[PDB]
Write an enzyme that holds these catalytic residues in place. Structure first.
Site, PDB file in Angstrom:
ATOM      1  N   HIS A  41       1.206  -1.537   0.108  1.00 20.13           N
ATOM      2  CA  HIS A  41      -0.111   0.241   0.182  1.00 20.13           C
ATOM      3  C   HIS A  41       0.687   1.476  -0.120  1.00 20.13           C
ATOM      4  O   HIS A  41       0.611   2.593   0.131  1.00 20.13           O
ATOM      5  CB  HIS A  41      -0.973   0.536   1.329  1.00 20.13           C
ATOM      6  CG  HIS A  41      -0.798  -0.128   2.383  1.00 20.13           C
ATOM      7  ND1 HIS A  41       0.110   1.038   2.719  1.00 20.13           N
ATOM      8  CD2 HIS A  41      -0.193  -1.262   3.694  1.00 20.13           C
ATOM      9  CE1 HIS A  41       0.241   1.249   4.423  1.00 20.13           C
ATOM     10  NE2 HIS A  41      -0.134  -0.339   5.016  1.00 20.13           N
ATOM     11  N   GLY A 143       2.377   5.690  10.032  1.00 20.32           N
ATOM     12  CA  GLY A 143       4.057   5.861   9.539  1.00 20.32           C
ATOM     13  C   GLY A 143       4.380   4.646  10.028  1.00 20.32           C
ATOM     14  O   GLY A 143       5.678   4.706  10.076  1.00 20.32           O
ATOM     15  N   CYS A 145       3.315   1.427   9.189  1.00 22.46           N
ATOM     16  CA  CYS A 145       3.651   0.193   8.985  1.00 22.46           C
ATOM     17  C   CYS A 145       5.068  -0.113   7.916  1.00 22.46           C
ATOM     18  O   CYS A 145       6.012   0.854   7.868  1.00 22.46           O
ATOM     19  CB  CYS A 145       2.911   1.043   7.560  1.00 22.46           C
ATOM     20  SG  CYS A 145       0.653   1.766   7.408  1.00 22.46           S
TER      21      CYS A 145
HETATM   22  C1  LIG Z   1      -1.637   7.028   1.735  1.00 24.31           C
HETATM   23  N1  LIG Z   1      -1.915   5.992   2.789  1.00 24.31           N
HETATM   24  C2  LIG Z   1      -1.140   5.662   3.878  1.00 24.31           C
HETATM   25  C3  LIG Z   1      -1.072   4.850   3.769  1.00 24.31           C
HETATM   26  C4  LIG Z   1      -0.468   4.909   3.209  1.00 24.31           C
HETATM   27  C5  LIG Z   1      -2.184   4.443   1.764  1.00 24.31           C
HETATM   28  C6  LIG Z   1      -2.714   3.903   3.318  1.00 24.31           C
HETATM   29  N2  LIG Z   1      -2.114   4.053   4.248  1.00 24.31           N
HETATM   30  C7  LIG Z   1      -2.105   3.419   5.805  1.00 24.31           C
HETATM   31  O1  LIG Z   1      -1.337   2.561   6.002  1.00 24.31           O
HETATM   32  C8  LIG Z   1      -3.443   3.549   6.153  1.00 24.31           C
HETATM   33  C9  LIG Z   1      -4.028   3.024   6.679  1.00 24.31           C
HETATM   34  C10 LIG Z   1      -3.382   2.912   8.703  1.00 24.31           C
HETATM   35  O2  LIG Z   1      -4.420   1.584   8.875  1.00 24.31           O
HETATM   36  N3  LIG Z   1      -2.534   3.114   8.632  1.00 24.31           N
HETATM   37  C11 LIG Z   1      -2.093   3.098  10.043  1.00 24.31           C
HETATM   38  C12 LIG Z   1      -1.488   1.925  10.745  1.00 24.31           C
HETATM   39  N4  LIG Z   1      -0.988   1.603  11.754  1.00 24.31           N
HETATM   40  C13 LIG Z   1      -1.659   2.278  13.111  1.00 24.31           C
HETATM   41  C14 LIG Z   1      -2.635   3.356  12.548  1.00 24.31           C
HETATM   42  C15 LIG Z   1      -2.784   4.655  13.325  1.00 24.31           C
HETATM   43  C16 LIG Z   1      -3.485   5.574  13.216  1.00 24.31           C
HETATM   44  C17 LIG Z   1      -3.644   6.058  11.693  1.00 24.31           C
HETATM   45  C18 LIG Z   1      -3.216   4.978  10.954  1.00 24.31           C
HETATM   46  C19 LIG Z   1      -2.497   4.011  11.210  1.00 24.31           C
HETATM   47  C20 LIG Z   1      -5.482   3.841   7.386  1.00 24.31           C
HETATM   48  C21 LIG Z   1      -6.225   4.105   6.457  1.00 24.31           C
HETATM   49  O3  LIG Z   1      -6.981   2.594   6.689  1.00 24.31           O
HETATM   50  C22 LIG Z   1      -6.311   1.558   5.658  1.00 24.31           C
HETATM   51  C23 LIG Z   1      -6.719   0.967   5.222  1.00 24.31           C
HETATM   52  C24 LIG Z   1      -5.971  -0.800   4.467  1.00 24.31           C
HETATM   53  C25 LIG Z   1      -3.950  -0.281   4.974  1.00 24.31           C
HETATM   54 CL1  LIG Z   1      -3.677  -1.448   4.781  1.00 24.31          CL
HETATM   55  C26 LIG Z   1      -4.458   0.367   5.633  1.00 24.31           C
HETATM   56  C27 LIG Z   1      -4.898   1.747   6.350  1.00 24.31           C
END
Ligand SMILES: CN1C[C@@H]2C[C@H]1CN2C(=O)C[C@@]1(C(=O)Nc2cncc3ccccc23)CCOc2ccc(Cl)cc21
Ligand SMILES: [Cl-]
Lengths: 301, 298
Positions: A41, A143, A145
């Site tokens: 992603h 951040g 991920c």
């Molecule tokens: C442009 N986007 C930003 C990055 C890269 C691309 C997708 N991204 C994400 O990781 C966004 C996201 C996610 O879960 N990110 C996060 C991970 N851990 C902790 C977090 C705590 C607070 C906020 C976000 C967090 C949140 C939205 O929903 C989804 C849905 C599916 C997937 Cl696989 C990922 C995501």
């Protein structure tokens, strides 16, 4: 003596953490030999996330679009391929700090250490368990991920998890290092929910054995139980069924403490029924389920 | 989201762990520059008398699969300093700092100079640590990381009869009224680190847990009168100031959070949990909460 939630020393994994930037997106990568592994992603925008076609998005990318940073050195991407939900960035430098490693896929109930990273820099290390609902109760911010889960038994780092997302309940979902998600999750922003979680029964029993080894016996009783009767009671408290595999796995702890597994099952049944009554077990007022039978043996012996 | 007991990344400290063998005793040493620091009980008491009888070749120092050669030895309080011929190339930027009770640090537990685990703990108000140590863990160190500098604050020396642990700073000064001798020693009555519980209640608010909050506030004096009754450490104006940023971030005044803690102490949780705990957690400092809920890196 003493029982702590203990993570593996993170040094071998720290030397593998890099920052991966693709457009506006910045996350962590795992640099092993000449390959940087990261969540696929990283190629998505917030718009692409609802229904992304990763094959379509990846074919439009060139190597110079992926900015990989290892400390204060920019690594040069010379190739890219996708394996399930992980992106593999072939780089022109093999990581000299690459440890002896394996990619292992873990089962629910298994524990691992997480090295939480932001911008390719490690901020903390903690201990996790793969929940029966295939989520992990981590501590992750935006951040994080690409942060990895691992076990370091002997001198080999077994990578078992890569962080990909946070579910609406604050729990986390990710993949093994081959890009296969744990659980029915997908790397999409579509409506996803963690299934009803359950307590890892074999781990609670292992932790009750750790308490016995540490001198805590107040919870023991004169009763035993059949495996079936234990499971009928356990299911009512949302505890995972205890299999004959689990009973076999607990064998060494049963031999070391002199308390039969089904005898310890009867203590657990009683604890579920009565609660703790102001008492604690290993400094906890709840039954701990993120210590496997292997963790208890390792820490106590 | 999520709140975990998180230790500092241990890599900078791992590159400093060595095995020290003297006679029948094998424990851990901390190799920084050309000096290996370890508990002086490795020579075991009249430590000056026991040390004068030892020569450099009696201390077998091992860094991985390489034997380091000892070229000098001196004692600084309860720590032995073994001058070696080789400066550790993996020596990080470091300081020796003595911590106060309530402060937290990471412990890299080692056996035979090899790191086996890392955990986060706190210096209890009774100067003990509730660690996880087996035989051979002596010389394992406690540390914090500030930017790129490792502040070493603890070296493990002993286990008290209650299963709690006692050790020194890296200058060999024990934390607490402990001595490095086989004699009757007991940890004093422990107290709860109040400022840390409040910091952990702020971390729960940041994570969406608000059930414990109430409309009430309290004076600092009334809070301390209640806190003393429940074996909680007094909360000073320093603590209230230290909690300022968390009070600003959550919108809950420190004395307002003190009134939630007062109700939790008199009434209990009532089958409820806070951050997955049925007890009030006191091994997260206000700085640990800020660092974890903002993601500071090393
Ligand atoms: C442009 N986007 C930003 C990055 C890269 C691309 C997708 N991204 C994400 O990781 C966004 C996201 C996610 O879960 N990110 C996060 C991970 N851990 C902790 C977090 C705590 C607070 C906020 C976000 C967090 C949140 C939205 O929903 C989804 C849905 C599916 C997937 Cl696989 C990922 C995501
Ligand atoms: Cl497994």
């Amino acid at each position: 003596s003493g029982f702590r939630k203990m993570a593996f020393p993170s040094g071998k994994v720290e030397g593998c953490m890099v920052q991966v930037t693709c457009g506006t997106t910045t996350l962590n990568g795992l640099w092993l030999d000449d390959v940087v592994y990261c969540p696929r992603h990283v190629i998505c925008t917030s718009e692409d996330m609802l229904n992304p076609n990763y094959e379509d998005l990846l074919i439009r990318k060139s190597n110079h679009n992926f900015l990989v940073q290892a400390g204060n050195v920019q690594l040069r991407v010379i190739g890219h391929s996708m394996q399930n939900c992980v992106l593999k960035l072939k780089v022109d430098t093999a990581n000299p700090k690459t440890p002896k490693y394996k990619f292992v896929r873990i089962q629910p109930g298994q524990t691992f250490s997480v090295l939480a990273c932001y911008n390719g820099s490690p901020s903390g290390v903690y201990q996790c368990a793969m929940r029966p609902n295939f989520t992990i109760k981590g501590s992750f911010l935006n951040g994080s991920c690409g942060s990895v889960g691992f076990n370091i038994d002997y001198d080999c780092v077994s990578f078992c998890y890569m962080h990909h997302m946070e579910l609406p309940t604050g729990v986390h979902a990710g993949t093994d290092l081959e890009g296969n998600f744990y659980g029915p999750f997908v790397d999409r922003q579509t409506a996803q929910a963690a299934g009803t979680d359950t307590t890892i029964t074999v781990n609670v029993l292992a932790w009750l054995y750790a308490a016995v080894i540490n001198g805590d016996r107040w919870f023991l009783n004169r009763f035993t139980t059949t495996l079936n009767d234990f499971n009928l009671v356990a299911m009512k408290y949302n505890y995972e069924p205890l299999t004959q595999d689990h009973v076999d796995i607990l064998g060494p702890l049963s031999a070391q403490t002199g308390i039969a597994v089904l005898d310890m099952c009867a203590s657990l049944k009683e604890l579920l029924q009565n609660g703790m009554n102001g008492r604690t077990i290993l400094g906890s007022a709840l039954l701990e389920d993120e210590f496997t039978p292997f963790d208890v043996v390792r820490q106590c012996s």
